[PDB]
Amino acid sequence: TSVKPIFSRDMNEAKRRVRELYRAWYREVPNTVHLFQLDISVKQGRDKVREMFKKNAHVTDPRVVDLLVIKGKMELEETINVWKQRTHVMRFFHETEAPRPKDFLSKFYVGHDP
Amino acid sequence: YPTKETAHWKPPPWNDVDPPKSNLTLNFGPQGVLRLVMELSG
Amino acid sequence: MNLMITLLTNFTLATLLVTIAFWLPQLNVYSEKTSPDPMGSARLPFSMKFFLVAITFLLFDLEIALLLPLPWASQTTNLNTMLTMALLLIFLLAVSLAYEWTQKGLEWTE
Amino acid sequence: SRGEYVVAKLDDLINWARRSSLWPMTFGLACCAVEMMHMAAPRYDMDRFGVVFRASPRQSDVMIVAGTLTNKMAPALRKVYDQMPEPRYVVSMGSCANGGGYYHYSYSVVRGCDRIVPVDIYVPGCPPTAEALLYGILQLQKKIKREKRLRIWYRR
Amino acid sequence: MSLVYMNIMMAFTVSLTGLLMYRSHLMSSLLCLEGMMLSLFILATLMILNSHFTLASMMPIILLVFAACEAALGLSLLVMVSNTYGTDYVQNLNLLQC
Amino acid sequence: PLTLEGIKDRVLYVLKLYDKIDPEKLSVNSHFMKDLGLDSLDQVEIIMAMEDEFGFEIPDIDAEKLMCPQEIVDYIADKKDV
Numbered sequence A: 001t002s003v004k005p006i007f008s009r010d011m012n013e014a015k016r017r018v019r020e021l022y023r024a025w026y027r028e029v030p031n032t033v034h035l036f037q038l039d040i041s042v043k044q045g046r047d048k049v050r051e052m053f054k055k056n057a058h059v060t061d062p063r064v065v066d067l068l069v070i071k072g073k074m075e076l077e078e079t080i081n082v083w084k085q086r087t088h089v090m091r092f093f094h095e096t097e098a099p100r101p102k103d104f105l106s107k108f109y110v111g112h113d114p
Numbered sequence B: 001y002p003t004k005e006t007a008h009w010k011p012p013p014w015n016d017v018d019p020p021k022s023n024l025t026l027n028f029g030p031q032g033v034l035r036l037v038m039e040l041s042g
Numbered sequence C: 001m002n003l004m005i006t007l008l009t010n011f012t013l014a015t016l017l018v019t020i021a022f023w024l025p026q027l028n029v030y031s032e033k034t035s036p037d038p039m040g041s042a043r044l045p046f047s048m049k050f051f052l053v054a055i056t057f058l059l060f061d062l063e064i065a066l067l068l069p070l071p072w073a074s075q076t077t078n079l080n081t082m083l084t085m086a087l088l089l090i091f092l093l094a095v096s097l098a099y100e101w102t103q104k105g106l107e108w109t110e
Numbered sequence D: 001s002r003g004e005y006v007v008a009k010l011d012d013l014i015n016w017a018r019r020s021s022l023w024p025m026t027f028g029l030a031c032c033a034v035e036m037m038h039m040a041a042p043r044y045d046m047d048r049f050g051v052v053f054r055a056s057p058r059q060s061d062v063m064i065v066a067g068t069l070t071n072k073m074a075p076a077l078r079k080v081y082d083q084m085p086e087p088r089y090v091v092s093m094g095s096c097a098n099g100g101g102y103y104h105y106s107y108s109v110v111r112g113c114d115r116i117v118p119v120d121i122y123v124p125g126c127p128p129t130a131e132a133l134l135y136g137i138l139q140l141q142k143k144i145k146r147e148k149r150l151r152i153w154y155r156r
Numbered sequence E: 001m002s003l004v005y006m007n008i009m010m011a012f013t014v015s016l017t018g019l020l021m022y023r024s025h026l027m028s029s030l031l032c033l034e035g036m037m038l039s040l041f042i043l044a045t046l047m048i049l050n051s052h053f054t055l056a057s058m059m060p061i062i063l064l065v066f067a068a069c070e071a072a073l074g075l076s077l078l079v080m081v082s083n084t085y086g087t088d089y090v091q092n093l094n095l096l097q098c
Numbered sequence F: 001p002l003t004l005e006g007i008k009d010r011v012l013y014v015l016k017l018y019d020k021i022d023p024e025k026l027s028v029n030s031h032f033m034k035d036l037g038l039d040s041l042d043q044v045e046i047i048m049a050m051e052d053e054f055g056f057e058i059p060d061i062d063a064e065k066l067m068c069p070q071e072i073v074d075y076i077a078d079k080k081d082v
C-alpha cells in the first residue's frame, strides 16, 4: 500500500496546492474575460470556475488530486499566454448544446437512454 | 519655510540619481503549417 | 497655371479612383463582417537603431542640401576656392561617416 | 425589353471578368497541397487560366482546402474564410476535406470541411490528379459563368 | 508693407500662442517649433526675393539647416523620455521642482 | 490603516460588499466555517478581497487559520506597525 508521491506527501499539501491554483484562477478570470472580448461577465466565469472546482471534489486520493492540480495548472498556464482561441475558452459553457432530459418521464418520452 | 502646499516635497537623493522605477513576444498565426510562439529583442 | 491645372486634374482623377474603390462596391448587399497579428497585448518596443538611422539620414540629407549647388557654382571665377570647399565638404561627409562607423553605430543594424 | 437585355449583357461581362482572374488561397496542409504544387508545374500551368500562384489570403477569390482539417485547425480555417472578401468560393481537394477519407473515424479529424465552411466544388481523389483539379477549377469557372446576380437584382 | 507679410506675422503669432499653452506631450511643442521654422523661412525668402538682394539667398537655406540639426537634437531628447517614463508627457516633468 | 477602528470598519465594509454573506446574521466575532456556513473557497476569496483592497501578499501557510474577523484584524495589525 506504500506508494511514491508526486508532489504532495499528504492531503494537506494537496489542499494547499488546490487553494493556490484556485487563487491564481480567480486572479486570471477578469483578464481572461477582457482579453478574448468574451460575452460573459466576470462573476459568471468565476461561477464556472467554482462549479468545476466543486464538481471535481469527491476524490480523496492525494496522488489523484495532485495530478488534477497539475492538469489545472497546465490549463491556467495555457490561459496565461494567448495559446487558446475564443472557442477553447467558450467550450466550458455548453451553450449550443440542447438540454438533455433529466427526469424519468421526459427520458421515457425521448427514447431508451437511461 | 514649509507651508501646506509644499509639505510633500521630499529631500532629493544624495547621489542625485533617480531610481529606475522587457522583450517582444510574437504569436505567429497558422495562416506545411506551423504556429510559432516567437520571442524577440528587436 | 498649367502646372496647377495638371496637379488638380491628377488629384481629381485619384479622387475618382478612390471613390470608385470605396463607394461603388457599396451597392452590393454581401455581408456585414463582425470579425471577433502576433502582437497579443504588449506595448510596441522602442528599437533605438531605427531612430538612430533615421536621424543619421536627416543629418546626411541636410548636408547633402549643403552639397547641392555645385552645378550652378561651377561657372564661378574663383575655381580654386570652390575646389577646396567642395573637397573639404565631401571630406567632412567622409569623416562623419567614419565616426558613425567607429562609435558602434553600424552594428546590430549594419 | 431593354432592361433585361442590358442587365444580361452586364452580368455576362462581370461574370467573365470574375471567372477569368480567380486568385486562389492555397492551404498547405497535407499531401494534396503537394499535388496542387505539382499542378502549378510547367506541364499543367494554372497560370495560363488567369489563376495566379500563392496569393495573399486577404485578396484571394477562391480557397482550396487541400489536406486533413483537424480539430486544432478548424477555428483558424474559419477565421481565414471570414477574413477573405466577398465573393468567396471554396474548392475541396482530396477525401480528407470531402468527408475525412482515411481518417473519418479518427478522434481528432473533422468529418469533412463542409462542417466549417460552405463548399462549392468537391474534387475526389487521394490525391486527385493535377488535371482532375484543373477540371474542377474549370467546372468552378463554368459555375460562375451561369450566375445571374444582376438579372435577379432587376427582377426583385 | 504687403499683405502677405502681415499674414506671415499672424501665422507666427499663431505658432507662438500654440507653442506656449500646450496640453499634450513634447511632440506638440516640437511641431509648433517647426511652425516657427516654416514661418521664418517663408518670411526671409519673400524678403530676399522681393528686394533683389542676390547674396542673401544664403540666408534662407542656412536658416533651416542649423536649427534643423537642433530640431534633431530635440527628437533625441524625446527618445530619452520615451526610454525613462514610457510616455513623453509634460505632466511627468515634475521631478526637478523639489 | 491608522487606527484599529477605521481598518476594522473598512474590513466590515468590504465584507458586506460580498453578496453571498448575510448581513443580518453577520456579527463581529462570527466564524466563516460554522456560524456563517460558508465554503472554504468563499473564505479564500474573502482573503483575496482583503489582499486586493489592502495591497500586499497574504501567504498560504497563515491564511489557513484566519477564520474570524477578529483574527483577520489581528493578523494584519501585527504584520503592520499600528
Ligand code: SF4
Pocket (backbone or CB within 6 Å): D030, D031, D032, D033, D066, D067, D068, D093, D094, D095, D096, D097, D101, D102, D125, D126, D127, D128
Ligand atoms: S486525401 Fe489522401 S492525398 Fe489528400 S491529404 Fe488526405 S491522405 Fe493525403
